[PDB]
């Protein structure tokens, strides 16, 4: 009974909307523009993970470092607790050692 | 619930179809049907 008895409404996807059509343009901004702009400068998102990558612990550390002062009180408390828990997990638990 | 299973009905039926000719709840309840169908095979 965990199965729907009717077909879901058809999902129409416009493969040629502007976003899809122009997707990827300027990905080669660096190599095709005398390296004035790095491709990572095209990344739009959280200030603490623009052109950067890491596991959850590194992401949380970077978030606290870069926007920790601007975080809300309980969000910052949760981030501190998450960093603490992730430190304990990655530095004290696991199959390999 | 990013990824949720949607075939569980058919996964259950794959066993219940073989279990349909048993006695008691072994032909209806998957938890019981699977054990007896494995024994049958």
């Amino acid at each position: 009974i965990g199965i729907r008895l009717t077909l879901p409404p058809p999902k129409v996807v416009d493969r040629w909307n502007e976003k899809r059509a122009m997707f990827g343009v300027y990905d080669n901004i660096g190599i095709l523009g005398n390296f004035e702009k790095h491709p990572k400068e095209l990344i739009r998102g959280p200030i603490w993970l623009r052109g950067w990558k890491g596991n959850e612990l590194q992401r949380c550390i970077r978030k606290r470092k870069m926007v920790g002062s601007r975080m809300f009180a309980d969000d910052l408390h949760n981030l501190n607790k998450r960093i603490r828990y992730l430190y304990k997990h990655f530095n004290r638990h696991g199959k390999f050692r | 619930l990013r990824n949720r299973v949607t075939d569980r009905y058919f996964r259950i039926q794959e066993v219940l179809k073989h279990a349909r000719h048993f006695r008691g709840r072994k032909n209806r309840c998957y938890r019981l049907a699977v054990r007896t169908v494995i024994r049958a095979f």
Binding site: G2, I3, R4, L5, T6, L7, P8, K11 | L1, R4, T6, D7, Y9, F10
Partner: peptide
């Protein structure tokens, strides 16, 4: 509701099969 279309299509096909078996057309 579970997002997806393939399981729903399969269940519709099975329902059609069962309906045909119960009341086969002339």
């Amino acid at each position: 509701v579970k997002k997806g279309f393939r399981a729903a299509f399969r269940f519709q096909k099975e329902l059609e099969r069962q309906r045909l078996l119960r009341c086969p057309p002339p």
